[PDB]
Scaffold this active site. Sequence first.
Site, mmCIF file in Angstrom:
data_model
loop_
_atom_site.group_PDB
_atom_site.id
_atom_site.type_symbol
_atom_site.label_atom_id
_atom_site.label_comp_id
_atom_site.label_asym_id
_atom_site.label_seq_id
_atom_site.Cartn_x
_atom_site.Cartn_y
_atom_site.Cartn_z
ATOM 1 N N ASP A 195 7.151 -5.458 -5.791
ATOM 2 C CA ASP A 195 5.676 -5.488 -5.890
ATOM 3 C C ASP A 195 5.047 -6.763 -6.402
ATOM 4 O O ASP A 195 5.076 -6.976 -7.622
ATOM 5 C CB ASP A 195 5.302 -4.258 -6.757
ATOM 6 C CG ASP A 195 3.887 -3.771 -6.495
ATOM 7 O OD1 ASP A 195 3.276 -4.463 -5.651
ATOM 8 O OD2 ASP A 195 3.421 -2.782 -7.074
ATOM 9 N N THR A 196 4.462 -7.533 -5.490
ATOM 10 C CA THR A 196 3.813 -8.811 -5.804
ATOM 11 C C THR A 196 2.448 -8.605 -6.436
ATOM 12 O O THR A 196 1.820 -9.544 -6.957
ATOM 13 C CB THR A 196 3.723 -9.743 -4.526
ATOM 14 O OG1 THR A 196 2.672 -9.141 -3.736
ATOM 15 C CG2 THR A 196 4.985 -9.794 -3.657
ATOM 16 N N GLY A 197 1.998 -7.358 -6.402
ATOM 17 C CA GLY A 197 0.708 -6.935 -6.922
ATOM 18 C C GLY A 197 0.723 -6.399 -8.336
ATOM 19 O O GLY A 197 -0.379 -6.286 -8.904
HETATM 20 C C1 LIG Z 1 -3.946 -1.779 -8.539
HETATM 21 C C2 LIG Z 1 -2.934 -2.880 -8.312
HETATM 22 C C3 LIG Z 1 -3.488 -4.272 -8.519
HETATM 23 C C4 LIG Z 1 -1.425 -2.528 -8.638
HETATM 24 C C5 LIG Z 1 -1.008 -1.431 -7.601
HETATM 25 C C6 LIG Z 1 0.407 -1.611 -7.091
HETATM 26 O O1 LIG Z 1 0.544 -2.466 -6.187
HETATM 27 C C7 LIG Z 1 0.920 -0.198 -6.766
HETATM 28 C C8 LIG Z 1 2.148 0.219 -7.269
HETATM 29 C C9 LIG Z 1 2.756 1.611 -7.229
HETATM 30 C C10 LIG Z 1 3.258 2.111 -5.867
HETATM 31 C C11 LIG Z 1 4.070 3.416 -5.929
HETATM 32 C C12 LIG Z 1 3.360 4.519 -6.744
HETATM 33 C C13 LIG Z 1 3.011 3.969 -8.141
HETATM 34 C C14 LIG Z 1 2.094 2.730 -8.046
HETATM 35 N N1 LIG Z 1 0.481 0.230 -5.433
HETATM 36 C C15 LIG Z 1 -0.572 1.018 -5.229
HETATM 37 O O2 LIG Z 1 -1.332 1.517 -6.074
HETATM 38 C C16 LIG Z 1 -0.723 1.334 -3.725
HETATM 39 C C17 LIG Z 1 -2.145 1.292 -3.205
HETATM 40 C C18 LIG Z 1 -2.259 1.734 -1.759
HETATM 41 N N2 LIG Z 1 -2.496 3.026 -1.503
HETATM 42 O O3 LIG Z 1 -2.143 0.864 -0.877
HETATM 43 N N3 LIG Z 1 -0.155 2.695 -3.611
HETATM 44 C C19 LIG Z 1 0.751 3.077 -2.746
HETATM 45 O O4 LIG Z 1 1.246 2.321 -1.889
HETATM 46 C C20 LIG Z 1 1.127 4.513 -2.869
HETATM 47 C C21 LIG Z 1 1.834 5.358 -1.864
HETATM 48 C C22 LIG Z 1 2.832 6.151 -2.332
HETATM 49 C C23 LIG Z 1 2.390 6.973 -3.474
HETATM 50 C C24 LIG Z 1 2.996 8.186 -3.736
HETATM 51 C C25 LIG Z 1 2.576 8.976 -4.791
HETATM 52 C C26 LIG Z 1 1.569 8.517 -5.620
HETATM 53 C C27 LIG Z 1 0.989 7.281 -5.385
HETATM 54 C C28 LIG Z 1 1.385 6.518 -4.313
HETATM 55 N N4 LIG Z 1 0.784 5.336 -4.055
HETATM 56 C C29 LIG Z 1 -1.317 -1.942 -10.058
HETATM 57 O O5 LIG Z 1 -1.840 -0.848 -10.367
HETATM 58 N N5 LIG Z 1 -0.686 -2.658 -10.957
HETATM 59 C C30 LIG Z 1 -0.536 -2.234 -12.368
HETATM 60 C C31 LIG Z 1 0.837 -1.509 -12.548
HETATM 61 C C32 LIG Z 1 2.031 -2.387 -12.119
HETATM 62 C C33 LIG Z 1 1.061 -1.113 -14.003
HETATM 63 C C34 LIG Z 1 0.755 -0.324 -11.562
#
Ligand SMILES: CC(C)[C@H](C[C@H](O)[C@H](CC1CCCCC1)NC(=O)[C@H](CC(N)=O)NC(=O)c1ccc2ccccc2n1)C(=O)NCC(C)(C)C
Lengths: 99, 99
Positions: A25-27
Amino acid sequence: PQFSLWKRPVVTAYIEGQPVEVLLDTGADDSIVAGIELGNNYSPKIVGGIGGFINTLEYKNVEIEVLNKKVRATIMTGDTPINIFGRNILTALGMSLNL
Amino acid sequence: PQFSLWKRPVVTAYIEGQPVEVLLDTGADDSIVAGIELGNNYSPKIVGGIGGFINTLEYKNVEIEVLNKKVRATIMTGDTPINIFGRNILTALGMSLNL
Ligand SMILES: CC(C)[C@H](C[C@H](O)[C@H](CC1CCCCC1)NC(=O)[C@H](CC(N)=O)NC(=O)c1ccc2ccccc2n1)C(=O)NCC(C)(C)C
């Protein structure tokens, strides 16, 4: 390596012998993983994203080993459906995003 | 070429001519841009994140120009704390994650 993003970047890393399946995750700015024993030297913190906040526990200087590379980074323990390896680790692994 | 993950991957993009500042998120399935009007051809969708699930209004085949590329991908509007360009634009743009 080289990763096409048609499918989520899912890899297998070791958080001190503990095998885990983590997302590239680059985000993320930090990294979170579940059901891992990392000890008692933690820093309590809350992180926010889409949907809100979650409480983690920050363990600094945890040795990790991913894609044939050993790194010593910071990881937090929170409950996520999927473990994340944000930039803290990507930058350390020497990871880039090319075109 | 490649780029670094030292620098948080933030770019500016024209989302149907509005300059929008976004985050290249290769750990996001979708694209969620906050507070932008795209029209009436929507369709409510549901996106999941770390803290929960948010309701969104889905817009398809939206015209996007980023990193000097013209691409038309599905954009989702909502309450994201930060504008993200998920892997659906990352495939389109022809981006990859290398090590
Ligand atoms: C908001 C940003 C900037 C960043 C989000 C991430 O890239 C972050 C990481 C995780 C992915 C897996 C589930 C947990 C969260 N991705 C996301 O939030 C993306 C947004 C999207 N729908 O395109 N989510 C998903 O791709 C995604 C799909 C599978 C899932 C299954 C169950 C529950 C949630 C799910 N969310 C973030 O929250 N960073 C803070 C950190 C690292 C503490 C989460």
